Amino acid sequence: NVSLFFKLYCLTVMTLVAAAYTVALRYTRTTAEELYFSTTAVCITEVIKLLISVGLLAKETGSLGRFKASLSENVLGSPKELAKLSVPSLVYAVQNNMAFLALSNLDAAVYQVTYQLKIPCTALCTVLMLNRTLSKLQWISVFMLCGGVTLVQWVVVAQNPLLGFGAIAIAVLCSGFAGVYFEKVLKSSDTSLWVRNIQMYLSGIVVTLAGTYLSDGAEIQEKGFFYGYTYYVWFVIFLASVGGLYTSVVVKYTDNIMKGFSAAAAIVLSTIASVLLFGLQITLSFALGALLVCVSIYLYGLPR
Ligand SMILES: CC(=O)N[C@H]1[C@H]([C@H](O)[C@H](O)CO)O[C@](OP(=O)(O)OC[C@H]2O[C@@H](n3ccc(N)nc3=O)[C@H](O)[C@@H]2O)(C(=O)O)C[C@@H]1O
Secondary structure: OOHHHHHHHHHHHHHHHHHHHHHHHHHHHHHHHHHHHHHHHHHHHHHHHHHHHHHHHHHHHHHHHHHHHHHHHHHHHHHHHHHHHHHHHHHHHHHHHHHHHHHHHHHHHHHHHOOHHHHHHHHEEEEEEEEOOOOHHHHHHHHHHHHHHHHHOOOOOOOHHHHHHHHHHHHHHHHHHHHHHHHHHHHOOOOOOHHHHHHHHHHHHHHHHHHHHHHHHHHHHHHHHOOOOOOHHHHHHHHHHHHHHHHHHHHHHHHHHHHHHHHHHHHHHHHHHHHHHOOOOOOHHHHHHHHHHHHHHHHOOOOO
């Protein structure tokens, strides 16, 4: 019961943060005069995620000596684990940068609807890499989920919709791969979740900053690294840091496919709550989408 409530809490936080992240990230790119470098905000997230993970390792070990021993033996002591997790950190580095580029050129609703095609991609990656398997019924349910969530989800600055869509196309493919790669690495040994996060973000901060130099290196020398930062930009980075850590926790107790199903349910249930609580009005798209998600969960969760 205590493990279940903690599991349901991490899901609701992950989804609520994911909802507030795309709206806030959209806002910061379409209102500012001095526009900030999206590559820097991505990199600062990896620093903040790394620091919170180190904090959470100290809590998990619960001792200054065994906190030292864990970082010595697992992080520094295993160079092969760092080289492994440098792959999905490089994939995520691209993903997170494509996320900023997409929302700079597209609406949050438009982005959210298009980005649900990660669900098929994530199912495809899990079947190939992870050594799991799906029946024809469960394959029908994954697309039925995808269709259901797309229905649930339905600027004075210059924009480029087709560049935005190209970014989502890249981001969809990174999400399925890096998540399933991370789930594979996480669930292949006894190593702690916060150690796997630290091993990844160490590569993450290097690769993101390398990308930050290559992308906007000349213009940062003129403008500044923290050029265009604000309460809302630091808020976006804050949500990006928290949202990433929660997804790692969700992928531990759930999997990358069930992450889609569960998050869909959390969006459906919390909206139905807010319809009753806050008198929130909803569309027929949502009403329809909600049922597809419910059926897809039922069809997916059935014994072969
Ligand atoms: C910050 C946030 O809310 N991210 C959501 C993202 C979404 O892609 C964002 O637009 C940009 O990442 O989508 C979800 O998740 P998605 O699979 O794309 O996850 C991408 C984000 O999770 C972070 N991550 C992953 C594993 C790990 N061990 N540590 C991490 O920090 C990555 O660094 C990356 O930021 C989804 O499937 O709905 C859910 C995520 O919650």
